[PDB]
Amino acid sequence: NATQINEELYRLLEDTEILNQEITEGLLKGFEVPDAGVAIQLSKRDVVYPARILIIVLSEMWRFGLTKQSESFLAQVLTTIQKVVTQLKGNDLIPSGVFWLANVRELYSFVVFALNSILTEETFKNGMTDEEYKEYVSLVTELKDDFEALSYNIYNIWLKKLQKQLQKKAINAVVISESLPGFEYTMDDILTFFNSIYWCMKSFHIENEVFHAVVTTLLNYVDAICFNELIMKRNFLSWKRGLQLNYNVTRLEEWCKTHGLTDGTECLQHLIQTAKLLQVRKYTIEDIDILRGICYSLTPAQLQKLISQYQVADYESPIPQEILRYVADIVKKEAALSIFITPETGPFTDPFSLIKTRKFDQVEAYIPAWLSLPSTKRIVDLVAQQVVQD
């Protein structure tokens, strides 16, 4: 009967000490992301199952007016998720983070959907007193704000971790790696990293703006650190080196062009222009005047630095002292009128906050076969029975 189901449901829902353990250990900390691989497409069902489970439990708590229970429940949910994202490392960094980014997004979008309802439809005032409704509204509101905070947090944390993972590979792959014959990580490693980001976000049904934001940030970061590596290289900067650098950066550019990013070049401006300098002639004063127009993103001090560390090749005529003089004279000129590019460290704006929330027409009751959650499964199954009856 219905009252039986409601009874056992109540008994299960007020039992916070078991539900919290099960949720925070088996579902959150014991999360298993599809180890199949990032390139492999999934149904949303297999991506946001924890959030949907949490949504069913929460909505059923709110059904029986268990506000305090929901408070503790969601406090531990938020804290646990942020902690889980904070502790990520290794080969699981990309797939796991995105996973949680999906789930948080699934949770937020629901909380939002709840608030609106509570405010819009009068029916939700029927079974509760004025001040219970008041504290209810207060709860859901503050919860919305807290989930904004959580989304922001795990996004920035994950992105910073990504920057950390790029740090090592990118400098060796872009500055030191030599692809072309006749002129350890390579460009294939970088390209593989970005391939993994792209495919992961694609398969976990993540919105594109987030992808654009992440890759833009990471690329600006690479441009910055690699420029900061180049402008310090002393017995390194040459025409051949310029050629190979140009080739590598070109590979990144092609990756951007082929993966839907229009503003890649703009994100790689400093490396592109440093590559352009090292190749164009720097013998005539005319050549330097043209060089000023080509490197429209480089300060005269940086130009002077790059030029003053140009390593000449066999039988190659050195950069004229008249030219070094002229350049130092333009630097002198515009000094009156630092050389390193400081990399943006974050925190950045959450891209999820710049798009519409996910609509919530329906919630699918589904608890993955391999999952071990007795109480939660009992709750979801009871609710499912109740829906089957109606």
Binding site: S59, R63, A114, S117, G127, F360, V388
Partner: peptide, 16 residues
């Protein structure tokens, strides 16, 4: 046990 309010989440059925 208290009277049940309207269920917010529109729970959908599923079968295998």
């Amino acid at each position: 046990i208290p009277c049940p309010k309207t269920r917010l989440a529109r729970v959908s059925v599923l079968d295998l």
